[PDB]
Design a protein around this ligand. Structure first.
Ligand code: NA
Length: 246
């Protein structure tokens, strides 16, 4: 099958070191060999070719800085969180136009609901086989992970789920085939995928899938559904994790 439940994660493989991003729904005039780099934060460097990816073909200046590296490129736009805000911005790359701005309702930001190793990781953007998502929490949710499916055109919240896991108790989270998975570790860098919440059914469960992790750091993890792989940035290297689905 093409989608399924996660059953295995591979070892992280190391791939201007980052943060690199690719579009899982490449849209002309961009292609699959188009790459974007966020400098680690207001400039986005664009590389048309993988060959040129070693000088940029274009440099974009964003209307405001990024809060964190938890941005995504999707269907020709950069989606990111504005610094010191709970606002998600859609920046169309080819036209250099802000096409949508949205306050995530009630979302904590700037150190209210970080992941377990901290940083400004309150709000994360994600892409899976069904499109664009945002992962966050609210005071009403008492720090539980909330996830919302976003309309990529106008950033309306098409559907929201309040899950039964505490955001500050997990090191990271990512969405694959409509299921939210969390990564948890008590005191070791190494960890486990310890929880799954299936947005198709509302059913959640505790898991024990090994998840190898190099640092006690709130990494940027970005699932790429086009490649069916996880990409991650640990402040030093871009890495990729292979996955297996049932
Ligand atoms: Na992420």
């Amino acid at each position: 099958t093409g989608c399924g439940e996660l059953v295995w994660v591979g070892e992280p493989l190391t791939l201007k070191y980052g943060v690199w991003m690719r579009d899982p729904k490449p849209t002309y005039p961009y292609t699959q060999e188009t790459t974007w780099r966020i400098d680690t934060v207001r400039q986005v460097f664009e590389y048309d070719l993988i060959s040129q990816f070693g000088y940029p073909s274009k440099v974009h200046i964003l209307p405001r800085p990024l809060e964190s590296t938890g941005a995504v490129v999707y269907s020709g736009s950069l989606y990111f969180q504005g610094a010191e805000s709970r606002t998600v911005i859609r920046y169309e790359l080819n036209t250099e136009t802000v096409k949508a701005e949205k306050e995530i309702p009630g979302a904590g930001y700037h150190g209210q609901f970080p992941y377990s190793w901290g940083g400004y990781t309150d709000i994360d953007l994600a892409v899976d086989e069904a499109g664009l998502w945002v992962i966050y929490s609210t005071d009403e949710a008492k720090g539980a992970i909330v996830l919302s499916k976003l309309n990529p055109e106008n950033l309306e919240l098409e559907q929201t789920w309040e899950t039964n896991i505490r955001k500050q108790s997990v090191a990271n989270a990512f969405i694959i085939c409509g299921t939210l998975y969390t990564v948890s570790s008590y005191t070791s860098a190494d960890a486990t995928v310890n929880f799954a919440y299936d947005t198709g059914t509302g059913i959640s469960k505790t898991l024990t899938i090994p998840f190898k992790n190099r640092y006690k750091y709130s990494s940027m993890i970005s699932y790429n559904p086009l490649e069916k792989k996880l990409f991650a940035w640990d402040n030093l290297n871009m890495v990729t994790y292979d996955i297996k689905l049932s």
